[PDB]
Design a protein around this nucleic acid. Sequence first.
DNA 1: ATCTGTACATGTACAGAT
DNA 2: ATCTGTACATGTACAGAT
DNA 3: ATCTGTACATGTACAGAT
DNA 4: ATCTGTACATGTACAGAT
Lengths: 356, 348
Amino acid sequence: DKLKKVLDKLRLKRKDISEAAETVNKVVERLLRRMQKRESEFKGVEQLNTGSYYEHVKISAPNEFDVMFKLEVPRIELQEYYETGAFYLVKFKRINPLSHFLEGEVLSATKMLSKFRKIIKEEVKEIKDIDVSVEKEKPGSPAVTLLIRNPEEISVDIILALESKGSWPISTKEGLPIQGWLGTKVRTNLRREPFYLVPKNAKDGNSFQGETWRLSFSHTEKYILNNHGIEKTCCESSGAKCCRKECLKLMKYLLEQLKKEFQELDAFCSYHVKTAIFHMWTQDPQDSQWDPRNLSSCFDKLLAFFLECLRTEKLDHYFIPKFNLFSQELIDRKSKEFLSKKIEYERNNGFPIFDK
Amino acid sequence: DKLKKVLDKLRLKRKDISEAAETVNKVVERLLRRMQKRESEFKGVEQLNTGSYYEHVKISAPNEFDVMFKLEVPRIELQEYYETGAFYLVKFPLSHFVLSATKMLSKFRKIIKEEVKEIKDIDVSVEKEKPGSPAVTLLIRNPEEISVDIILALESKGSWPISTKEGLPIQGWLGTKVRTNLRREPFYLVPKNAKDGNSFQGETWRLSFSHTEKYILNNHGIEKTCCESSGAKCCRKECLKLMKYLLEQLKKEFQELDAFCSYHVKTAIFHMWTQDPQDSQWDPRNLSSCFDKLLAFFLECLRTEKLDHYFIPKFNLFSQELIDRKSKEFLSKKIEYERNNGFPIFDK
DNA sequence: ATCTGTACATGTACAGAT
DNA sequence: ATCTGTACATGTACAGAT
DNA sequence: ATCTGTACATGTACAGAT
DNA sequence: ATCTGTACATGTACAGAT
Ligand SMILES: Nc1ncnc2c1ncn2[C@@H]1O[C@H](COP(=O)(O)OP(=O)(O)OP(=O)(O)O)[C@@H](O)[C@H]1O
Ligand SMILES: Nc1ncnc2c1ncn2[C@@H]1O[C@H](COP(=O)(O)OP(=O)(O)OP(=O)(O)O)[C@@H](O)[C@H]1O
Ligand SMILES: [Mn+2]
Ligand SMILES: [Mn+2]
Ligand SMILES: [Mn+2]
Ligand SMILES: [Mn+2]
Ligand SMILES: [Zn+2]
Ligand SMILES: [Zn+2]
């Protein structure tokens, strides 16, 4: 009931959705069309909407949209980057519009991203209907981010992705453990869909920096978010409603509110809570372990699970089991203990950060 | 325990499946070849396997197989025949055939008969044509008797006909998303090959949802994991097998049941699966009461003379027009007897 | 004349609104 | 409870191309 | 256009375990 | 008696090659 009111605060307004989507779809459509023009290296690129807004777990406002511009690259060979599981070099087999981004048969990611960014920047210049600019590049980001002032501020991440239709890389063989929850047929069908590669774009100074790509499963996460129950009728008009998405929203909002205040939490991002709850949904497969009447204890057990991931320094990528999002190389102990304490304080004092 | 032993009897043998299928697949691949490996009107026909063998509810022997040869036809107008729900006139390569079902079936049949004639490695012939059948039926002996029904079908990719809008009522069982996706698939038309002497009989086709029934049979739980390797077994298919066996055994003995077919049983269990959607209502420990509830539901269908097409609800398969009252009362008496005596007919 | 990539046309699950 | 805007899957029309 | 290759669903069969 | 793990078998979706 206390959490029932927070969700009411977090709920998007149709008026805002309508206003924001009108602008966003206009800008996205124009950019998609410019990539189809001339001898553009990105001709054939197709659009895939992803992220919280299209999973219906966007909270507070419709002010951030994620969209994949995906390009199918056939006849592709991958080299895993130093057994990390998630990062790859991409290589080609013949001697192609990606000609100008090739090196030693190796597809440069920062070369491709730069050209992609240059096209988007020029196209944005010739929009005089909407107040829209291109954000300064961020290290580690695979995206060209648009800032729309619709009056209201709106971010759009245009994510460049390679699309391979072959079978998924073996580092994912033990990932996606949905057998006891969504089952073997769903798992088999999901793994028949393409996989995606986005630029790592780390800028950190290490070898292969500009030629490292990162696996993306945004499309698989979108399907799961929207087909999340063991029962096919879960959250449908002739079935029972669960509180799975509501628990994600509350967890997202806790991290968002804390990150707004404490810049010690810069290492953390909402993908961490999204990954955590995919494990909770696998651990607790039954729709009855997510009854809306038990929202408080369902949110609590998610917090307890997240706190144990922070303390034990282990939050395995849901799709790549050997990739630890909470490794020391990515987040130091200090950052994790700080978040542990901040969460435990919220937990134990009525969630006062929900009232800010 | 009695029912478990019956199901052990009904179970097909790996060796039998392997010998029957490699011969059936030989013949079918060759007919499918001929259909487009010639300037025939059926160039572009594609194969779709259907029926109990491919749903894994075939019982006793692998001795009957069903195959659709389906052909895409663009821009066709349907016209419902006299409000029957299931039967239609088709209208606008094939212009040798208003699209007459009788005219198309016969050329299709003539092709198959010719290709069967030039098969020398398998003992195979074409059964005499049956009024009422949309099929060309092949008889194989290797030495086991095996019959194959080659079913000609038109494939339309528009919205399903209006008479189905109330059909397929899976919303509380498989859900709205499965229903919407199933209805995004094509719908099929097959010949109505009756000789009854009625008016438009020769150019009427009948709706087929064999493709949709296959998906259901193999995606039948309310839980996605039903009968999967990380899920629980249910006894839904076993119940269909048992009810199928009861009717097969009765039809063997009683000529009075010639009007009944396994599709009646299949239809009745689709309604029971919709009435009782929870997988726990089909627990394997409760096989007996599950079988009994199917019997009771089937008997209520007989008693009220009402068994609606699961996809076309106004089409009553138990109409007085199609099955006489005395047939239904005869079958009622025989089922009530088997029920009340421990199913003696299951022991022979 | 026919061919075809682009985009309209149709239908409905999701979830906010009343 | 019903009404309703957006997203999205798939079927089809046709301007401009061949 | 056609056809093989791959992966894993659905089954049956059976020994060893419970 | 049933359950579980491995072996053995066919069916079917679709990527990629030719
Ligand atoms: N570090 C990451 N590793 C893998 N995938 C990621 C990562 N960060 C983001 N993604 C993918 O990109 C999508 C968009 O990311 P984003 O940061 O906008 O979050 P979101 O899930 O849309 O939620 P919100 O925008 O409301 O914070 C995610 O849903 C996820 O699929
Ligand atoms: N009267 C009918 N109306 C509609 N569809 C039918 C009818 N009879 C058969 N079919 C379709 O054709 C398929 C093949 O029918 P068939 O008579 O071979 O039975 P079956 O379901 O395969 O089982 P079995 O052959 O083991 O009795 C059916 O499963 C169904 O999809
Ligand atoms: Mn986002
Ligand atoms: Mn983003
Ligand atoms: Mn059959
Ligand atoms: Mn048949
Ligand atoms: Zn749900
Ligand atoms: Zn089952």
